[PDB]
């Protein structure tokens, strides 16, 4: 194996698990074994909670500025090690090195940096009731938080969950996806090197059974989960049933991109291609239902296909590549099944549609960038999240029609519109039932911008000032300065 | 029956249920039948959701000030009808008319009044990213919210759940406790009279199975529940597993009141009595573990018992009464079982301890105000919420000991201290793991003050500005004003 | 006279001044004497301050909700008396009854209503420093505030200054313009009837020398002034030099309206006419420099002139009138001098340009709606605020040129653009140096929206949540719970 | 001279003035000439404004995080150079090296660090008006700001004024006191080294005439001033009269320290000594009216005198010194004049009272730590700020008396109480008319805590989130998405 045996990270050090079990992580471009990874046992999760409880006490007793400085040092280390971490993330995920060098660590560190600076701005309120009595609130740490990661943006997710948790004075136990377990360990080392106390960021490893141990643990105050809707429902159920934990969930989507007849069509085609094929289509917010107004449909499709034909499919370790394999064979099987469904249900295959098996591609999990035209709302590929590089193009006649069809889903993660018109841009966005909305762009997720789902695409939010506040619990304190008037007299 | 046949309230009118089933509500002071009440079916809940969806559209399309004015009119009607509603609430709950006339409707209307004024102050954010792009957020209504009530403060709970929901532009379907189904229908009539559109406040009736219909319904965006911890775990589980609803939960407690050696002991005894015997002990925030420092224990207990002996136990319809029956026979059986447990495990009975069965008391559910001394942390009466008039007095030696023992519970609703010392008052409160904290007072819950539980006593909060914010969902809108730089070039 | 002798309003009643001096107010449509008005002396201002100090104590001692309810009662009275107050305001100002019935009292009451609801939401902060110490802030009333009014919106200005001051717990002494002294006394009667304590809203009367008495008085904590830039500089100077008062200033402008080549030209012409001729041109925020892109200049001008020709100039007491006289002979002389200047410097007269003196118009102060074309940036009519019905139309070629020329002024009150393009609308507004910015509309000033000037057009803001915050002063309280470590040991 | 010829700092470099004039700065411990400093001319101030305008454009066009990183680098440099800057500040001010090494740069950098992290959290609002229209606000930089410093905390004041100004995207032109001109130049170098663009922090030098050039300059948007009340009144007057600048002022005080009969008397004596003799008494917030309740007066005075006798008066360059000379001969003359007044008016001299003239002290400006007892409210030393090491002790009988006498002043900067009682601590502080209030401590000014004066002790605030917001101006933007309804039709 490339990276050897990897283990748990508890109490400021790498540590042997006590399960007697390991799992494998692979390079999905080559099938090379990257590491054997020890799986945490229930005892290990218990120990990680005890460790986090102890570290949280020391961390929360520091001043807000002491925490700020330590997180700022972690940011420095992430910037310094960006390229090395990007190489590891590329190996583990299959995403192109051109992506992991520019996006994954950059934006992960961006959010740690943002919350490092805001760690001093967490304030309660004060309000008088009368001259003799007033109320103040404290925003106290929750305690020990759990984060459960997905495999498409492993280190970015670890950063985005741990940053507001740590900035607010919590500890976090993080479990990466078993598909991509490696970079979370590097973040744990960096937090320790930056000065984070032992236990404040612990990493446990394993499959969903280890995630369930975290969701059920009575010593954990909050769970933050990124993954599929079916798993999210199990997590929220168990986290609530076990000990009434606070919950945040980010759960995938079938987000609509609406290209109006007064769109800039070059802009629209660029957006649609980014919104469907970045990270080989494995992005929760991807704009996978592309609604295009009839009058510009043919011109728009011509532009999309010309851009899709120029995608540089290749080895993700090659800097010239901008589209690589999917992250697993299970991914490839599911995506190819959806492509079969689209063909069977009468969608028109306009580009791609098959696994690449020539030369080195045969050793990886490569599916061509795929575009279906003449799609209908009742098709499986239109109704269900594919989580791969499959664009569905749907025509519409009127603005009201596009909005109604865009909203006719139980998903609600993202939405976007392309139009040059001032009124249409805002009025359409205001009617779309999604938490993350883009006008004349797609995909950017600034640290300042709260992101999360409507409907079954999630609960709660990440990023922005509001998310830092949601990693605290409110204590209201009423001070009575006057005589307590007896109620029983 | 006193009040006749009572039904559902859907789409601005009373309406027949379709379950084929009814349940009875009684006067717990006399056993008189107050009403036969129709139970909602699954199809009735569906109809209530469709009605709420329609009303929510009209309500949200109004301006914030239009909603504010209508809620202010509802406040006027609640003030005008205070005494008539207080009589109804006294009949249904058994709480003294002296309480329901001064507290239940007054404070329910107080919170509607507060949120009416704040309905115009729900604001998103704006933040620039660069000259070419900026973000704004919208705080949009969730849609249809569900509220599930408890029987100890029926109309107050209905007011506190519906006020922020309606002010933020939502509709609410409310289910009162089957023990106290009557006053919620009066609130629904009042909202309609005040100008609330049909469907914006609907009432369904029934036992826990009807509450579960609401928690599972895919058309409901949020559930707010008041009740016991074990029911709350079931609700949060089903609400999350069904459709990833947002959840607020207020779940009872075993709140500590710490009387220090430098407390004003008259103040402390007054607080302890209020904190244990108001509403015949049926208050979630009651200070039912009374910790008293050894040096003042005997003097404190003497003062407590002198006040307990002056409690005016009697018919709740008599204005001179300040302590009446419990709300049901099941409540009485549970409370009497706890008294049996306390005696068996060795707690010293200092006052009360038995059912009152002389003269008219035999026809009601009356338990004497009960005080146990020499309690231990391991006793069932100290570990478990009794939800009746049973005070447990525990001695301690040191401040560190009192704080450790106060925190050694999975509950976390309220806490309080009595001390004349500036440093001790705040330093102790800051270390107590509870959401609702009182210094030299107990029990007041101003509209401005967020209230809710730590640990297993709750999720989320009620009241205060922050609670209005959590009856909206955040939509982030990024506006790109410049060229979209192609990612696939 | 129509309304008789009018006096001061101090300590909850009308009261004789002690200056020995009076001044007259006239109806600018007819020259009829409306009232003889007593002028306040320095000793009267002292008495008003002592009265305000006493009333402020009672008012601030009330709860926030008590103040909220009283302000809401004042709103009810203003709505009930809207038409009678509108008639008075039309007589005193000369503005059409169609305006005063729909705008002046409606929007004055709108802002009192908004702040009434927010009076309960004034909150300080709390922030911990370390376990042993924390800070909270109080937002305390300033004390006695002064408001100085202008004659174009007399009762609206009185409402907008007094509403945040009173909601925050202050008293206010208000001096209306000597041109329009009457409606402020009616507002003072209404506040008293609504339950405002004696002294909380006092009215003094007189010219600028009485305004200076308020600005200099050592017992006044803050001055809010509406008026011309040159008077404002005198007020802010004296307010600061006398006792370091806080200051809010709203000072008029020369606001640009930019009509782009992709504007809806019917929309643009409607906006331009409203933005220049409402209230006979006597609006501080009027868009009196109308920049029009060359390609649409002729078509835009044709539409403007067609609308100007349909303005209904007439008696302001007739409901069919939508354009009446100016508020005084001094105003007319100034406006006519500007028209003379524009003609001399070469501006092309397109409409209007002279006093109306036929039939009844001869008895009033009427100037025709006037439009100049082919204007230059160096013209006096383009550089200087006219405060009358005189539109200056300026052609431009490029967007960069329009923005540069729009910004090339020491004014900075308002600005606006007309364009159908999403990018242009926001990018242009973000570059315009004005506090009040409109896209595809003009003139609306919602209670939620902070309004005020950049550069020499003002200091501070009115309306919105932030303005309520600036009618309080911050007290920071640090609580030390631990040992004070000696600095001199 | 020790440091040679020092000059202006404009456009990223040291620069020759064009006045032909210099002034001298001295070491007040020895009379050694530290530097000749060039005085800025009017042309130099004009050039500094043009430079600041250009640098502000580049600085504001950066992202908030780019500004944050550059300010964070400035903090690193200040930490690295703390001891060297502390030595310079000790030479220029006369304050003990034990103070300048621990306080002046530490807390100056603390505030830059705080605002560096908050530079990303400056947000406007968004609020809907109706489906067809919404408002958003921008918080835009003011532009070029001016800061005018005092000599008691030269580099700390430069940091505290420049930090929120720069974090919010402004440039600042700073003029240090001519008594202490040196360390502001070092801060300017550090900002440049950290990456601040040329012109964003410029330093001009000279006496009050140069300060007046800044206050009058039409290109400056805001003035922030620290100094005496008489000068503050001139600054606010001229800043308002010239161009309606925004103004912040911090202006000295006569702050009361109230020692109650239930104070910890050792704590109280420690506080009183710190609050009167730190920085040789040259602190604006010093607690120079020490009110002591009669029952503890003698015990309190005995403790104060014992601590005063242990003050280590000596050379400020000696690390063992904790009390050095005053900053100038003019200071010494004024302080000795006040001491003469106290003696003449009958105050009892309890400690100190004279200049130290033995050995090396004769070459410095040394006044002994001085305590007066049996003071009265009508004494000059009690009514007027001395700005030197002169404590006035006043006895009182009742709590109401102490509060009334504490408030009977036109000052209102700080106040504090010493008491062990919870109720008394808060109820007294809530009644004291001062912006900066301390319970059982004195003098700490955390970055999170807004600080400034009531009454004639100031306008506006420094520090806290609120001050960052006051270095922006609000632009409200109304977007109309629907049809503009013609007003003239
Ligand atoms: N503020 C609070 O935290 C608060 C106040 C009042 C009561 N309580 C708690 O309520 C308890 C009362 O117990 P109880 O057995 O009479 O009532 P409960 O807790 O079982 O029921 C409360 C409400 O939930 C409904 N319900 C019951 N089972 C449900 C289910 N599975 N799904 C959905 N809704 C369901 C009930 O019909 C009722 O409306 C007290 O012991 C106390 O702990 C809490
Ligand atoms: N919102 C605004 O910015 C706004 C709205 C209305 C009017 N204005 C301005 O008001 C101007 C009207 O000019 P005007 O000469 O008739 O009135 P003005 O500006 O001189 O006076 C306005 C008010 O200030 C008082 N006043 C006058 N001199 C004073 C002094 N030295 N100290 C204190 N108060 C003093 C007046 O009595 C009156 O109440 C218009 O040209 C326009 O620029 C501004």
Residue numbers in the entry:
A (entry chain B), B (entry chain A), C (entry chain A), D (entry chain B): 2 to 490
From the paper:
As a part of efforts to develop new therapeutics and diagnostics for melioidosis, the Seattle Structural Genomics Center for Infectious Disease (SSGCID) has determined the crystal structure of betaine aldehyde dehydrogenase (BADH) from B. pseudomallei (BpBADH). BADH catalyzes the irreversible oxidation of betaine aldehyde to the osmoprotectant betaine and is being investigated as a drug target for drug-resistant bacteria, notably Pseudomonas aeruginosa, because its inhibition blocks choline catabolism and leads to the accumulation of the highly toxic betaine aldehyde. The structure also contains 21 helices, 21 strands, four β-hairpins, four β-bulges and 25 helix–helix interactions. BpBADH has a prototypical BADH topology and shares considerable structure and sequence similarity with the ortholog from P. aeruginosa (PaBADH). The 489 amino acids in each monomer fold as 20.4% β-strand, 39.3% α-helix, 2.5% 310-helix and 37.8% loops, forming six β-α-β motifs that contain five β-sheets (four mixed and one antiparallel).
The monomers are very similar and have an r.m.s.d. of ∼0.17 Å for main-chain atoms. The high-resolution structures of betaine aldehyde dehydro­genase from B. pseudomallei (BpBADH) and P. aeruginosa (PaBADH) reveal a conserved NAD-dependent topology and structural similarity. PaBADH is known to be inhibited by disulfiram through the catalytic cysteine; thus, we hypothesize that BpBADH will likewise be inhibited by disulfiram. Disulfiram binds irreversibly to Cys286 in PaBADH, which is in the highly conserved cofactor-binding cavity of PaBADH and BpBADH; the corresponding residue is Cys285 in BpBADH. Since the key amino-acid residues in inhibitor-binding sites are conserved, the previous studies on PaBADH could facilitate the development of small-molecule inhibitors of BpBADH.
